[PDB]
Ligand binder design. Structure first.
Ligand SMILES: *[C@H](C)[C@H]1/C(=C/c2[nH]c(/C=C3N=C(/C=C4\NC(=O)C(CC)=C4C)C(C)=C\3CCC(=O)O)c(CCC(=O)O)c2C)NC(=O)[C@@H]1C
Ligand SMILES: *[C@H](C)[C@H]1/C(=C/c2[nH]c(/C=C3N=C(/C=C4\NC(=O)C(CC)=C4C)C(C)=C\3CCC(=O)O)c(CCC(=O)O)c2C)NC(=O)[C@@H]1C
Lengths: 355, 143, 355, 144
């Protein structure tokens, strides 16, 4: 019962706010419980390089706990050297940093669990926020006031209502369906989706959505496109110069899924030429973004159309409380030997997929 | 990179087996896919009504398209040094991707085995050994 | 047959965008139509000072057309000098700049019309956008990227979800009711309203809203407050230091109604002390905002919590097209002598109210 | 801070005492003025009755007498100061369409201020009653 968990260092910000659970200083709010229970807890942010605290303790550890906002990469190299490992937890949602194929093909006896559901509302709200900010031209308008200007015609000339627009999502899982739900009362012209599997007929009708089976047919009729899909072959590098030339002229694109689904230099060129009128979201490749990444400085012809943020949509204080509670629930199912996990939380039960 | 420059110069200046393999894969690529598809569906009659992930006329044509993708990707690998472009473009999350589509992964492996047999049969004994290693790299990721 | 309309000068922006109808260069898109009839059209932005083009032609004009984004103040003095005036049109919604009481009590035969409905969706979308930007802490997040930084903990420590919050509107007319409709699928804890008149019971139940009859009881239970009310006695200066001290500690306030409903220096002090966590909106007093207006530089303790813009929510290109069509419809009802106005558009019909 | 304002304030401090005597009566007898005037209002406008009755409640009747207190305190402020400007800016700006949206008959609010004028000036000298009467009239004129 040795436990290693890696989180980022929040510095002075950790003392300002006690509900900032997912950091090295505050330890997901479970440190006192683990110590009372007789377990040993190593907490560190030092995860890169062969001389790292993480590597120093992995040959020993029984449990490793990770976060997608500072991921420890659980490589086969590290997996072979981890002789006592029985359980990997994601305090959040997202497991691209773990070699699930290796574990499953080798048949190792390692369970892998995440707190599924805990991030979906927060991301969906961030999509709605970014669409309104781009379509209504908010960023240059707030800039005028901070800078002590006032010139309405310069803002109004590229501002629209979202009412009456056609809106499409690439991906209709938990996050994309919740985006569609929140858009219904804004009176769009139509809602559309593309996905490798159909939504059930009852779910389609609740939001008035129509399935489009061809990706190029989908984007060619949309004023607004949002990406809510996983990263694999056939989605990696999907948003390139060729597909971008099928978009309507002057629409808006939002991506809070994975940065590598886009070709970074190609969307920047589309924004400068006017093929796109704006781009926004919070995911990058590489991540964290280098200081010279092209998405930092790109603009449209009027000097706006950029609504990027760092990667934080799933880390609001309401979301942090949910996976503090979810991590302790998972750990206790293990400690007790009940193994009464929530079915939706299991992504690998002793190196095996379920159902 | 110096190691990459070296593998390119070898194609230009040294051995000609990579050139011969590429000549065959481009020159009869349509015959390789048509002949291998016939053999695949005889060994895996799951062009049948039930599951049949490839049941339609339309879904059968999508299957043969994917076979064309892997043949063009293996051709690129032969021309270049190595298998790195094969891994990063054709194998990324391929097991989870096909699983979400309903298509059985071990049947995709069998399709690449069938393309290996037809293509290799048109080559010299030595060229067929060299080409065969590239097909095997794909088969191993799906079986 | 003689018409004066006053709009702002848009300068070079007018040539960039044909649908920017409400400006001096583009003339609401109805020049040519007016010239093809037998009418004379004066267009000017020069409305202040007794030496003005507006005053130059008031003694003679048959019709005056105004906009709430650059209003010509139709004072009793000007009304006395306007010997031929028979019709005042607002190309938009909002008639505070016209002395309706003087026209009505004196019994002058001047009718007054606006194009009602044309602005309400645009303003309601701007309220939804501002609530999300403040609650989720967007402004400092985008600033990190523009400035080539990356520090997630400094953003996350003051970012929340809108799900599960209690939200109240002061005023439940056309705009406030459309705000409530768009909030329903975001899963708030409860929706509340205050108004001098009750909503019908079917309308209350469609959005799950509860009437609160006392203004201090309303704000004391709300996490988010939005103002959607007209300006008069007992609304003027309503948001002052005493009422602000009844708000919950650390909530958010949004105002796209009228600036003078707030005491400007009092809300700035509340934001600095932490009584409010953020303030946003697009309306000011005085307006346009002086370069030293306190709402430009005010921030909360972390340097954020400000989402002000200049006054533009009702001036998107979609709203401007509606204004242009509605103005020509009103003018034609007058020119033909049918006077078949839409009932909702009438505020005064020959100097008196209708019912 | 304007020279005309300073002049009006200094007059209250240094010259005439009629503004001082008027304010003594309005503050000292304020509760009797409202109670007596409300009785007279409801005898002249029995629309404290079931139907319309904008003031039909025991609760709504108390809200009406609250508004009467507002205008008496605002007239008191005006007497102490130079002038009627604060009465205009605080009590009369949106009034009328405000009361219209409440269902309150505007001419009945005017009548309430007439009734306060009669009780208040009845307690004053002849000269003080003429000076004070002009401030009441300024409110009545905006509502009738
Ligand atoms: C034929 C051997 C088998 C078969 C194939 C089949 N595939 C699909 C759908 C897709 N195939 C891919 C594959 C790729 N796209 C890429 O860009 C790359 C990288 C080079 C690869 C490997 C993708 C992305 C899809 C989905 C999206 C698209 O079609 O563009 C289908 C259709 C399945 C359906 O039900 O819709 C089929 C039938 N199926 C079999 O049964 C054979 C064993
Ligand atoms: C009594 C003479 C009449 C009467 C009065 C009445 N008023 C209301 C409600 C309100 N009155 C006001 C007035 C003001 N508030 C201010 O701050 C100022 C400036 C000093 C004024 C003049 C307001 C704002 C309201 C509404 C908000 C509130 O109550 O705070 C009512 C209640 C009406 C209802 O149906 O809810 C009543 C009854 N009614 C009569 O019929 C009398 C003639």
């Amino acid at each position: 019962m040795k436990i290693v968990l890696v989180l980022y260092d929040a510095g002075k910000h950790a003392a300002d706010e006690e509900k900032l659970y997912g950091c090295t200083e505050n330890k997901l709010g479970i440190a006192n419980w683990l110590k009372d229970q007789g377990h040993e807890l190593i907490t560190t942010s030092d995860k890169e390089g062969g001389n790292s605290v993480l590597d120093q303790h992995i040959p020993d550890a029984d449990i490793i706990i990770t976060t997608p906002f500072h991921p420890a990469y659980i490589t086969k190299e590290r997996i072979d050297k981890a002789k006592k490992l029985k359980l990997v937890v994601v305090a959040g949602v997202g497991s691209d940093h773990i070699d699930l194929d290796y574990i499953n093909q080798t048949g190792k006896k390692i369970s892998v669990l995440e707190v599924t559901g805990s991030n979906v509302v927060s991301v969906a709200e961030h999509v709605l926020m970014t669409m309104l900010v781009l379509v209504r031209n908010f960023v240059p308008a707030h800039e005028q006031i901070i800078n002590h200007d006032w010139e309405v015609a310069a803002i109004a000339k590229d501002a629209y209502d979202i009412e009456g627009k056609t809106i499409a999502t690439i991906g209709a899982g938990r996050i994309g369906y919740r985006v569609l739900e929140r858009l219904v009362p804004f009176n769009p012209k139509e809602l559309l989706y593309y996905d490798y599997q159909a939504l059930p007929k009852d779910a389609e009708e609740k939001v008035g959505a129509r399935r489009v089976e061809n990706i190029e047919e989908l984007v060619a009729q949309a004023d607004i496109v949002t990406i809510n899909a996983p990263l694999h072959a056939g989605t990696k590098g999907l948003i390139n110069k060729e597909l971008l030339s099928k978009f309507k002229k002057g629409p808006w694109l939002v991506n809070p899924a994975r940065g590598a689904i886009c070709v970074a230099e190609d969307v920047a060129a589309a924004l400068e030429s006017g093929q796109l009128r704006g781009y926004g979201g919070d995911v990058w490749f590489p991540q964290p973004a280098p200081k010279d990444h092209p998405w930092r400085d790109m603009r449209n012809k009027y000097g706006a159309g950029n609504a990027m943020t760092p990667h934080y949509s799933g880390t609001t204080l309401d979301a942090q409380t949910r996976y503090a509670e979810g991590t302790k629930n998972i750990l206790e199912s293990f400690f007790t030997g009940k193994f009464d996990y929530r079915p939706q939380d299991i992504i690998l039960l002793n190196g095996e997929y379920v159902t | 990179s110096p190691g990459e420059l070296d593998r390119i110069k070898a194609f230009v200046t040294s051995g000609e087996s990579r050139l011969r393999i590429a000549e065959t894969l481009t020159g009869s690529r349509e015959r390789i896919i048509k002949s291998a598809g016939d053999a695949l569906f005889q060994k895996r009659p799951d062009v049948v009504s039930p599951g049949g992930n490839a049941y339609g006329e339309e879904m059968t044509a999508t299957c043969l398209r994917d076979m064309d993708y892997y043949l063009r990707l293996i051709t690129y690998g032969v021309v270049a040094g190595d298998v790195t472009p094969i891994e990063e473009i054709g194998l990324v999350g391929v097991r989870e991707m096909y699983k979400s589509l309903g298509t059985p992964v071990d049947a995709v492996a069998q399709a690449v085995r069938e393309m290996k047999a037809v293509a290799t049969g048109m080559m010299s004994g030595d060229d067929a050994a060299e080409a065969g290693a590239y097909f095997d790299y794909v088969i191993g990721a799906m079986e």
